[PDB]
């Protein structure tokens, strides 16, 4: 059932993830320092962290089979709308249910709900974000399923502004059938039970998290003194 092409797809995506996710988190020392000890003390550090992650998402997307057959405009539209969602997906790797925090190797780079609030965000986003991270973690995805979901998230034909939606759908369909077939052939029960439908539900959850983050980002970035603390890439991708 899992064809040669589908095994090839999975190998490329696993490699692309390995080349764009550094589980040592060594680069975090380059970011502006976290401030925790009211002001948005974490915004400089978390702006750099987000900006760093946007670069990784772009590097991943470029290696998705078929992605660079799209036009430049379509590649841009897809990354602009999905980047926030893939950052949330990718962040699940560091999330720990022990204390509902994101553990990036050390105490200074361990992020909880208070850190996210200290970048300007409210429980309207943070509570559903934690619920998302908990429900994704409980799926106990294979790494194969994790990177397929990130790629399916990126190549979505219903993103606003997409021009060649028929070609975007054809690329996504190739990835969806790869994932559907992978689960059916390689994910043993009971973990496989309704797994594809649960994964697609998480993509719907991401659309709602996307909407809420965009709402709060527009509110935060509308104030020039906050925008001053963002990075140029964040302003270009998330908006200005």
């Amino acid at each position: 059932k899992l064809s040669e092409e589908q095994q090839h797809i999975i190998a490329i995506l696993l490699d692309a993830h390995h080349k764009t996710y550094d589980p040592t988190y060594a680069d975090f020392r380059d970011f502006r320092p976290p401030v925790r000890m009211s002001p948005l003390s974490m915004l400089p550090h978390l702006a750099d962290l987000v900006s760093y992650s946007i670069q990784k998402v772009i590097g991943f997307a470029k290696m998705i089979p078929g992605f660079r057959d799209l036009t430049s405009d379509d590649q841009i539209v897809l990354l602009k709308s999905s980047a926030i969602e893939v950052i949330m997906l990718r962040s699940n790797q560091s999330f720990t249910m022990d204390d509902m925090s994101w553990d990036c190797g050390s105490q200074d780079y361990k992020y909880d709900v208070t850190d996210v609030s200290k970048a300007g965000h409210t429980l309207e986003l943070i509570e559903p974000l934690i619920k998302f991270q908990v429900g994704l973690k409980k799926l106990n995805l294979h790494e194969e399923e994790h990177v397929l979901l990130m790629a399916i998230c990126i190549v979505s034909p219903d993103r606003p502004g997409v021009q060649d939606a028929k070609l975007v759908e054809a690329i996504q369909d190739r990835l969806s059938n790869t994932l559907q077939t992978y689960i059916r052939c390689r994910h043993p029960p009971p973990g496989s039970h309704q797994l594809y439908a649960k994964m697609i539900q998480k993509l719907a959850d991401l659309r709602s998290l996307n909407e809420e983050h965009s709402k709060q980002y527009r509110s935060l970035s509308f104030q020039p003194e906050n925008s001053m603390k963002l990075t140029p890439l964040v302003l270009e991708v998330f908006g200005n």
Binding site: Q55, I58, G59, K62, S72, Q75, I76, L79, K80, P232, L233, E236, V237
Partner: peptide, 11 residues
């Protein structure tokens, strides 16, 4: 909306 940094990272 020109996206030169995104476009450059895609190149």
């Amino acid at each position: 909306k020109n996206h030169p940094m995104l476009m450059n990272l895609l190149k």
